[PDB]
CSV table of C-alpha atoms and ligand atoms in Angstrom, one decimal:
chain,number,residue,atom,x,y,z
A,15,UNK,CA,12.7,-5.0,21.3
A,16,UNK,CA,12.5,-6.1,17.6
A,17,UNK,CA,16.2,-5.1,16.7
A,18,UNK,CA,15.8,-6.7,13.1
A,19,UNK,CA,12.7,-4.4,12.4
A,20,UNK,CA,10.9,-7.5,11.0
A,21,UNK,CA,7.1,-7.7,10.5
A,22,UNK,CA,5.3,-9.1,13.6
A,23,UNK,CA,2.1,-11.1,13.7
A,24,UNK,CA,-0.2,-10.9,16.8
A,25,UNK,CA,-2.9,-13.3,17.9
A,26,UNK,CA,-4.9,-11.4,20.6
A,27,UNK,CA,-7.5,-13.2,22.8
A,28,UNK,CA,-11.0,-11.7,22.8
A,29,UNK,CA,-10.2,-9.8,26.1
A,30,UNK,CA,-7.0,-8.3,24.6
A,31,UNK,CA,-8.8,-7.5,21.2
A,32,UNK,CA,-11.7,-5.6,22.9
A,33,UNK,CA,-9.6,-2.4,23.6
A,34,UNK,CA,-8.1,-1.2,20.2
A,35,UNK,CA,-5.8,1.7,21.4
A,36,UNK,CA,-4.5,-0.4,24.3
A,37,UNK,CA,-3.6,-3.2,21.9
A,38,UNK,CA,-1.9,-0.8,19.5
A,39,UNK,CA,0.1,0.4,22.6
A,40,UNK,CA,0.9,-3.3,23.6
A,41,UNK,CA,2.3,-4.2,20.0
A,42,UNK,CA,4.4,-1.1,20.2
A,43,UNK,CA,5.9,-2.2,23.6
A,44,UNK,CA,6.8,-5.4,21.6
A,45,UNK,CA,8.5,-3.2,19.0
A,46,UNK,CA,6.1,-4.0,16.1
A,47,UNK,CA,6.2,-0.3,15.0
A,48,UNK,CA,9.9,-0.7,14.0
A,49,UNK,CA,9.0,-2.7,10.9
A,50,UNK,CA,6.4,0.0,10.0
A,51,UNK,CA,3.9,-2.8,9.4
A,52,UNK,CA,2.3,-5.4,11.6
A,53,UNK,CA,-0.4,-8.2,11.2
A,54,UNK,CA,-3.1,-8.8,13.7
A,55,UNK,CA,-5.1,-12.0,13.5
A,56,UNK,CA,-8.4,-11.4,15.4
A,57,UNK,CA,-10.0,-14.1,17.7
A,58,UNK,CA,-11.7,-16.8,15.6
A,59,UNK,CA,-15.1,-16.1,17.1
A,60,UNK,CA,-15.0,-12.4,15.9
A,61,UNK,CA,-16.6,-11.3,12.7
A,62,UNK,CA,-17.4,-7.7,11.7
A,63,UNK,CA,-20.4,-8.7,9.4
A,64,UNK,CA,-22.5,-12.0,9.2
A,65,UNK,CA,-22.3,-12.3,5.4
A,66,UNK,CA,-21.2,-10.2,2.4
A,67,UNK,CA,-24.1,-11.5,0.2
A,68,UNK,CA,-26.0,-8.2,0.0
A,69,UNK,CA,-23.4,-6.0,-1.7
A,70,UNK,CA,-23.9,-6.7,-5.4
A,71,UNK,CA,-25.6,-3.3,-6.0
A,72,UNK,CA,-23.1,-1.4,-3.8
A,73,UNK,CA,-21.7,1.4,-6.2
A,74,UNK,CA,-17.9,1.9,-6.7
A,75,UNK,CA,-18.2,5.6,-7.9
A,76,UNK,CA,-14.7,6.0,-9.4
A,77,UNK,CA,-13.0,2.6,-10.4
A,78,UNK,CA,-9.5,3.3,-11.7
A,79,UNK,CA,-7.8,1.5,-14.6
A,80,UNK,CA,-4.1,1.3,-13.4
A,81,UNK,CA,-1.6,1.9,-16.3
A,82,UNK,CA,1.9,0.9,-15.3
A,83,UNK,CA,4.9,2.1,-17.3
A,84,UNK,CA,8.6,1.1,-16.7
A,85,UNK,CA,11.3,-1.5,-16.7
A,86,UNK,CA,14.1,-3.0,-14.5
A,87,UNK,CA,12.0,-2.7,-11.4
A,88,UNK,CA,11.2,1.0,-11.7
A,89,UNK,CA,7.6,1.9,-12.6
A,90,UNK,CA,5.1,4.8,-12.7
A,91,UNK,CA,1.4,4.0,-12.2
A,92,UNK,CA,-1.2,6.3,-14.0
A,93,UNK,CA,-4.9,6.2,-13.0
A,94,UNK,CA,-7.6,6.3,-15.5
A,95,UNK,CA,-11.0,7.0,-13.8
A,96,UNK,CA,-13.6,4.9,-15.4
A,97,UNK,CA,-17.4,5.4,-14.8
A,98,UNK,CA,-19.2,4.0,-11.8
A,99,UNK,CA,-19.8,0.2,-11.6
A,100,UNK,CA,-21.4,-2.1,-9.1
A,101,UNK,CA,-19.6,-4.9,-7.1
A,102,UNK,CA,-21.5,-7.4,-9.2
A,103,UNK,CA,-20.0,-5.8,-12.5
A,104,UNK,CA,-16.5,-5.4,-10.9
A,105,UNK,CA,-16.6,-9.1,-9.6
A,106,UNK,CA,-17.6,-10.4,-13.1
A,107,UNK,CA,-14.6,-8.5,-14.7
A,108,UNK,CA,-12.2,-9.6,-11.8
A,109,UNK,CA,-13.0,-13.3,-12.2
A,110,UNK,CA,-13.1,-13.2,-16.0
A,111,UNK,CA,-10.5,-15.1,-18.2
A,112,UNK,CA,-9.0,-11.7,-19.1
A,113,UNK,CA,-8.3,-10.5,-15.6
A,114,UNK,CA,-8.3,-13.4,-13.2
A,115,UNK,CA,-5.3,-14.7,-11.1
A,116,UNK,CA,-2.8,-16.9,-13.0
A,117,UNK,CA,-2.2,-20.5,-11.8
A,118,UNK,CA,0.6,-20.8,-9.2
A,119,UNK,CA,2.1,-23.2,-6.6
A,120,UNK,CA,4.0,-21.0,-4.1
A,121,UNK,CA,3.5,-17.2,-3.5
A,122,UNK,CA,7.0,-16.6,-4.9
A,123,UNK,CA,5.7,-17.7,-8.3
A,124,UNK,CA,2.7,-15.2,-8.1
A,125,UNK,CA,5.2,-12.5,-7.0
A,126,UNK,CA,7.4,-13.1,-10.0
A,127,UNK,CA,4.3,-13.0,-12.3
A,128,UNK,CA,3.2,-9.7,-10.8
A,129,UNK,CA,6.6,-8.0,-11.3
A,130,UNK,CA,6.8,-9.6,-14.9
A,131,UNK,CA,3.3,-8.6,-15.9
A,132,UNK,CA,2.4,-5.4,-14.0
A,133,UNK,CA,2.7,-3.3,-17.2
A,134,UNK,CA,0.4,-5.5,-19.3
A,135,UNK,CA,-3.4,-5.8,-19.5
A,136,UNK,CA,-4.1,-2.9,-17.1
A,137,UNK,CA,-6.5,-4.0,-14.2
A,138,UNK,CA,-9.3,-2.0,-12.7
A,139,UNK,CA,-9.1,-1.1,-9.0
A,140,UNK,CA,-12.3,-0.3,-7.3
A,141,UNK,CA,-10.5,2.0,-4.8
A,142,UNK,CA,-11.3,4.8,-2.3
A,143,UNK,CA,-15.1,3.9,-2.0
A,144,UNK,CA,-16.5,5.9,1.0
A,145,UNK,CA,-18.1,3.3,3.2
A,146,UNK,CA,-18.0,0.4,5.6
A,147,UNK,CA,-18.8,-3.3,5.7
A,148,UNK,CA,-19.0,-3.3,9.5
A,149,UNK,CA,-22.4,-3.9,11.2
A,150,UNK,CA,-23.6,-1.1,13.5
A,151,UNK,CA,-23.4,-3.3,16.8
A,152,UNK,CA,-19.7,-4.2,16.2
A,153,UNK,CA,-17.8,-2.6,19.0
A,154,UNK,CA,-14.3,-4.2,18.6
A,155,UNK,CA,-11.9,-2.7,16.0
A,156,UNK,CA,-14.6,-0.8,14.1
A,157,UNK,CA,-12.7,1.1,11.4
A,158,UNK,CA,-15.6,3.5,11.1
A,159,UNK,CA,-15.4,4.4,14.8
A,160,UNK,CA,-11.9,3.6,16.3
A,161,UNK,CA,-12.1,6.7,18.7
A,162,UNK,CA,-8.4,7.5,18.7
A,163,UNK,CA,-6.9,11.0,19.5
A,164,UNK,CA,-7.3,11.7,15.7
A,165,UNK,CA,-11.0,12.3,16.3
A,166,UNK,CA,-9.9,15.7,17.8
A,167,UNK,CA,-9.5,17.0,14.0
A,168,UNK,CA,-13.4,16.6,13.5
A,169,UNK,CA,-12.4,13.6,5.9
A,170,UNK,CA,-9.6,11.1,6.7
A,171,UNK,CA,-11.2,9.9,9.9
A,172,UNK,CA,-13.8,8.0,7.6
A,173,UNK,CA,-13.6,4.4,6.3
A,174,UNK,CA,-12.7,3.6,2.7
A,175,UNK,CA,-13.4,0.3,0.7
A,176,UNK,CA,-11.1,-1.2,-1.8
A,177,UNK,CA,-12.4,-3.8,-4.3
A,178,UNK,CA,-9.3,-5.4,-5.8
A,179,UNK,CA,-8.6,-7.8,-8.6
A,180,UNK,CA,-5.5,-9.6,-9.7
A,181,UNK,CA,-2.5,-7.3,-10.3
A,182,UNK,CA,-4.1,-4.1,-8.8
A,183,UNK,CA,-1.4,-2.2,-6.8
A,184,UNK,CA,-0.8,0.4,-4.2
A,185,UNK,CA,2.5,2.4,-4.8
A,186,UNK,CA,5.2,3.2,-2.2
A,187,UNK,CA,3.9,5.7,0.3
A,188,UNK,CA,3.4,6.7,4.0
A,189,UNK,CA,0.0,7.8,5.2
A,190,UNK,CA,-1.3,11.3,4.8
A,191,UNK,CA,0.3,13.4,7.7
A,192,UNK,CA,2.5,10.3,8.4
A,193,UNK,CA,-0.5,8.9,10.3
A,194,UNK,CA,-1.1,5.3,11.2
A,195,UNK,CA,-3.6,3.2,9.2
A,196,UNK,CA,-5.7,0.0,9.8
A,197,UNK,CA,-6.6,-2.4,6.9
A,198,UNK,CA,-9.0,-5.2,7.2
A,199,UNK,CA,-9.3,-7.8,4.5
A,200,UNK,CA,-13.2,-8.5,4.6
A,201,UNK,CA,-13.1,-11.3,1.9
A,202,UNK,CA,-11.5,-12.8,-1.1
A,203,UNK,CA,-8.0,-13.4,-2.4
A,204,UNK,CA,-4.9,-12.2,-0.5
A,205,UNK,CA,-3.2,-8.9,-0.5
A,206,UNK,CA,0.6,-8.8,-0.5
A,207,UNK,CA,2.6,-6.0,1.2
A,208,UNK,CA,6.1,-4.7,1.3
A,209,UNK,CA,7.4,-2.4,4.0
A,210,UNK,CA,10.4,-0.2,4.7
A,211,UNK,CA,11.2,0.3,8.4
A,212,UNK,CA,10.5,4.0,9.5
A,213,UNK,CA,14.2,4.3,10.6
A,214,UNK,CA,15.1,3.5,6.9
A,215,UNK,CA,12.4,5.7,5.2
A,216,UNK,CA,14.9,8.5,4.2
A,217,UNK,CA,17.0,6.0,2.4
A,218,UNK,CA,14.0,5.0,0.3
A,219,UNK,CA,13.2,8.7,-0.5
A,220,UNK,CA,16.8,9.2,-1.5
A,221,UNK,CA,16.8,6.2,-3.9
A,222,UNK,CA,13.3,7.4,-5.3
A,223,UNK,CA,14.7,11.0,-5.8
A,224,UNK,CA,17.6,9.7,-7.6
A,225,UNK,CA,15.5,7.7,-10.0
A,226,UNK,CA,12.6,10.2,-10.6
A,227,UNK,CA,14.6,13.5,-10.4
A,228,UNK,CA,12.0,15.3,-12.5
A,229,UNK,CA,9.2,14.4,-10.0
A,230,UNK,CA,11.5,15.4,-7.0
A,231,UNK,CA,12.1,18.9,-8.5
A,232,UNK,CA,8.3,19.4,-9.1
A,233,UNK,CA,7.3,18.1,-5.7
A,234,UNK,CA,9.5,17.4,-2.6
A,235,UNK,CA,7.0,14.7,-1.4
A,236,UNK,CA,6.3,13.2,-4.8
A,237,UNK,CA,5.8,9.7,-3.3
A,238,UNK,CA,2.6,11.0,-1.7
A,239,UNK,CA,1.1,11.0,-5.4
A,240,UNK,CA,1.1,7.1,-4.9
A,241,UNK,CA,2.4,6.5,-8.5
A,242,UNK,CA,5.8,5.0,-7.8
A,243,UNK,CA,6.4,1.3,-7.9
A,244,UNK,CA,9.8,-0.2,-6.9
A,245,UNK,CA,10.4,-3.9,-7.1
A,246,UNK,CA,11.8,-5.8,-4.0
A,247,UNK,CA,14.9,-6.7,-6.3
A,248,UNK,CA,15.6,-2.9,-6.8
A,249,UNK,CA,15.4,-2.3,-2.9
A,250,UNK,CA,17.8,-5.4,-2.5
A,251,UNK,CA,20.1,-4.0,-5.1
A,252,UNK,CA,20.4,-0.5,-3.4
A,253,UNK,CA,20.5,-1.8,0.2
A,254,UNK,CA,17.1,-0.6,1.2
A,255,UNK,CA,16.0,-2.9,4.1
A,256,UNK,CA,12.5,-4.2,3.7
A,257,UNK,CA,10.2,-7.0,4.7
A,258,UNK,CA,7.2,-8.7,3.0
A,259,UNK,CA,4.0,-10.2,4.3
A,260,UNK,CA,0.8,-11.7,2.7
A,261,UNK,CA,-2.5,-10.7,4.4
A,262,UNK,CA,-5.4,-13.1,4.2
A,263,UNK,CA,-9.1,-12.7,4.5
A,264,UNK,CA,-10.1,-11.9,8.1
A,265,UNK,CA,-6.8,-10.4,9.1
A,266,UNK,CA,-5.7,-6.8,9.9
A,267,UNK,CA,-2.7,-5.0,8.8
A,268,UNK,CA,-1.4,-1.9,10.8
A,269,UNK,CA,0.9,0.7,9.2
A,270,UNK,CA,2.8,2.9,11.7
A,271,UNK,CA,3.9,6.6,11.3
A,272,UNK,CA,6.4,7.1,8.5
A,273,UNK,CA,6.2,3.4,7.5
A,274,UNK,CA,6.6,3.2,3.7
A,275,UNK,CA,4.4,0.5,2.2
A,276,UNK,CA,3.5,-0.9,-1.3
A,277,UNK,CA,1.8,-4.1,-2.6
A,278,UNK,CA,-0.8,-5.8,-4.7
A,279,UNK,CA,-4.0,-7.9,-4.7
A,280,UNK,CA,-3.9,-11.6,-5.6
A,281,UNK,CA,-7.4,-11.5,-7.0
A,282,UNK,CA,-11.0,-10.4,-6.3
A,283,UNK,CA,-11.2,-9.1,-2.7
A,284,UNK,CA,-12.5,-6.4,-0.5
A,285,UNK,CA,-10.5,-4.4,2.2
A,286,UNK,CA,-11.6,-1.6,4.5
A,287,UNK,CA,-9.2,1.1,5.8
A,288,UNK,CA,-8.9,4.5,7.8
A,289,UNK,CA,-6.2,6.4,9.5
A,290,UNK,CA,-5.7,6.8,13.2
A,291,UNK,CA,-3.4,8.4,15.6
A,292,UNK,CA,-1.6,7.8,19.1
A,293,UNK,CA,0.3,10.4,21.3
A,294,UNK,CA,3.5,9.3,19.5
A,295,UNK,CA,2.1,10.4,16.0
A,296,UNK,CA,1.7,14.1,17.1
A,297,UNK,CA,5.6,14.7,16.6
A,298,UNK,CA,5.5,13.0,13.1
A,299,UNK,CA,2.5,15.2,12.3
A,300,UNK,CA,4.4,18.5,13.0
A,301,UNK,CA,7.4,17.1,11.0
A,302,UNK,CA,5.6,15.6,8.0
A,303,UNK,CA,6.9,16.7,4.5
A,304,UNK,CA,3.7,17.4,2.5
A,305,UNK,CA,2.9,17.4,-1.2
A,306,UNK,CA,3.3,21.1,-2.5
A,307,UNK,CA,2.2,20.7,-6.2
A,308,UNK,CA,-1.5,19.5,-5.4
A,309,UNK,CA,-4.3,21.7,-3.9
A,310,UNK,CA,-3.7,17.3,-0.8
A,311,UNK,CA,-4.7,16.2,2.8
A,312,UNK,CA,-3.4,18.7,5.5
A,313,UNK,CA,-4.2,18.6,9.2
A,314,UNK,CA,-3.4,21.7,11.4
A,315,UNK,CA,-1.2,20.4,14.2
A,316,UNK,CA,-2.1,23.4,16.5
A,317,UNK,CA,-4.9,21.5,18.3
A,318,UNK,CA,-2.6,18.5,19.1
A,319,UNK,CA,0.3,20.6,20.3
A,320,UNK,CA,-1.8,22.8,22.7
A,321,UNK,CA,-3.4,19.7,24.2
A,322,UNK,CA,-0.6,17.0,24.5
A,323,UNK,CA,2.6,19.4,24.1
A,324,UNK,CA,1.5,22.7,25.9
A,325,UNK,CA,5.1,23.2,27.2
A,326,UNK,CA,6.5,23.2,23.6
A,327,UNK,CA,3.4,25.1,22.1
A,328,UNK,CA,5.2,28.5,22.2
A,329,UNK,CA,8.6,27.2,21.1
A,330,UNK,CA,7.1,25.3,18.1
A,331,UNK,CA,5.0,28.3,16.9
A,332,UNK,CA,8.2,30.4,17.0
A,333,UNK,CA,10.0,27.8,14.9
A,334,UNK,CA,12.5,27.0,17.8
A,335,UNK,CA,11.3,23.3,18.1
A,336,UNK,CA,14.3,21.2,17.2
A,337,UNK,CA,13.0,17.8,18.2
A,338,UNK,CA,14.5,14.8,16.5
A,339,UNK,CA,12.2,11.8,16.1
A,340,UNK,CA,13.6,8.5,17.4
A,341,UNK,CA,11.6,5.8,15.3
A,342,UNK,CA,12.6,2.9,17.7
A,343,UNK,CA,10.7,4.5,20.7
A,344,UNK,CA,7.2,3.1,21.6
A,345,UNK,CA,4.1,5.3,22.1
A,346,UNK,CA,4.0,6.7,25.8
A,347,UNK,CA,0.6,4.8,26.1
A,348,UNK,CA,2.7,1.5,26.2
A,349,UNK,CA,4.1,2.5,29.7
A,350,UNK,CA,1.7,0.0,31.4
A,351,UNK,CA,3.4,-2.9,29.5
B,16,LIG,O1,-4.6,-2.1,-0.5
B,16,LIG,C1,-4.5,-0.8,-0.6
B,16,LIG,N1,-5.2,-0.3,-1.6
B,16,LIG,C2,-5.3,1.0,-1.8
B,16,LIG,N2,-4.7,2.0,-0.9
B,16,LIG,C3,-4.0,1.4,0.1
B,16,LIG,C4,-3.3,2.3,1.0
B,16,LIG,N3,-3.6,3.7,1.1
B,16,LIG,C5,-4.4,4.4,0.3
B,16,LIG,C6,-4.4,5.7,0.7
B,16,LIG,C7,-5.2,6.9,0.2
B,16,LIG,C8,-6.3,7.3,1.1
B,16,LIG,N4,-7.1,8.3,0.6
B,16,LIG,C9,-3.5,5.6,1.8
B,16,LIG,N5,-3.1,4.4,2.0
B,16,LIG,N6,-2.5,1.8,2.1
B,16,LIG,C10,-2.5,0.5,2.2
B,16,LIG,C11,-3.1,-0.4,1.3
B,16,LIG,C12,-3.9,0.1,0.3
B,17,LIG,CL1,-19.0,-10.9,-2.8
B,18,LIG,ZN1,-1.3,3.2,3.0
B,19,LIG,ZN1,3.1,16.8,-5.1
């Protein structure tokens, strides 16, 4: 199942789509998790909100100006927190001559423009806005209430909004605690993604440590700072396997445990995201290498070990748990498929 570890796209029917956790387990039986990223195109009839015409006065409390430094495909992104602005103000700046998307034929052209110009004219990313664009009655794939085993913890169970503009980027990273994530592009211009299969994640980390040794000495898990940008050409040069995909409005992206991802926004858009878990994640949770230098998201794995692994509970607390994760294996919940 998926030996190539290539990004898979799924087109569930309304019946298949209704049960989120079951569908995550189905895509895993198909080997989608091997890529570390999957796309899910929901049924045509499904909409999480009737219209996005009432969000002009929605406040983005901490928009960030993204300053990128670097050359030859290696970059460091610095965030400058700007004062609170409304979606109306943000959209005006996003669509202005200074910050709008350049003209292009194919995506390859826009991708070249992104890697050529990411250090110039720093954009503003309306990122990490606490909130949802989902209407209350929406029961299918509601990011605000997915009801996975992650709910056992209960502030990383909560939804976040991302208002993008051309050239805004998310640096190479896996999720906090090496969790899964769900990303829905509500509206606007596309969002392009790069992924490194979980089975090759250590190779990406080794490459990154070699390039930023100062950062590697200060923090073992320095990629969790979400400041490191590495071009696909650099990954190709050093033999890091990866894949790319463009997410369009109305599509979901799923990131899997220990799936490194990066990317950028084509223009003015809005995405919603949260983290979630499956029984498979638990092991990734106990083995996750965390950021040491920052006082960072940490989940106590005790609750999850005493419920789903009670046989290994005593051995793990003693430090005798020598379990080696096989990234190719699907979640136990995929057994029905
Ligand atoms: O488009 C994004 N924009 C911004 N952030 C993104 C992201 N993540 C952002 C976090 C930080 C959550 N606090 C974790 N993943 N992962 C994937 C995509 C994005
Ligand atoms: Cl809008
Ligand atoms: Zn992410
Ligand atoms: Zn750190």
